Design a protein around this ligand. Structure first.
Ligand code: U6J
Length: 155
């Protein structure tokens, strides 16, 4: 067809950094326009064959840091997996990079919020951006994780 279709909840976060929910084949022509080097994938489920073939054909590296898709109020975001994903984001060699989960609201929102903390954003600005994507599914647990996340080791 004649039009591009960004994936669910697509946004540019920064120079060379994007966020979304799970891309499907209708989104591949749009993703090709970004010249991605990397995908940071935050779900534990195996990457579907369709997505794997797109990744391979397009020369994109897959980084998988599987965070269990927990529902409130029993959400347990591993600090370690967010820290390893931030290390990938902070290396310009991996850019352009797309961060995605299933809908790009919770696991993706936490990783982006922790990056904003490293960029010295005030918490209210971090939460406002998180809530723009999470909307009616904004979780206190996601924001509490960002509130407590320690930026000592990086900064
Ligand atoms: O287990 P997940 O976290 O991978 O999936 C949850 C979705 O979480 P999701 O997988 O989207 O998380 P992320 O990809 O991290 O946003 C969430 O979707 P949403 O809250 O809209 O993001 C949805 O909400 P619904 O569509 O309103 O019924 C449900 O909470 C759903 O939990 P499940 O129904 O037990 O699989």
């Amino acid at each position: 067809e004649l039009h591009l279709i960004p994936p669910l909840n697509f946004s540019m976060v920064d120079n060379g950094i994007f966020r979304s929910g799970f891309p499907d084949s209708a989104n591949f022509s749009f993703l090709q326009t970004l010249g991605l080097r990397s995908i940071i994938y935050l779900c534990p489920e195996p990457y579907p064959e369709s997505n794997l073939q797109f990744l391979k054909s397009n020369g994109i590296r897959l980084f998988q840091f599987g965070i269990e898709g927990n529902k409130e109020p029993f959400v347990n975001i591993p600090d370690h997996k967010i820290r390893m994903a931030l290390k990938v984001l902070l290396d310009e060699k991996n850019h352009p990079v797309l961060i995605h989960s299933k809908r790009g609201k919770h696991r993706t929102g936490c990783l982006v919020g922790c990056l904003r903390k490293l960029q010295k954003w005030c918490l209210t600005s971090i939460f406002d951006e998180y809530q723009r994507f999470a909307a009616a599914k904004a979780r206190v647990s996601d924001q509490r994780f960002m509130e407590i996340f320690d930026v000592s080791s990086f900064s």
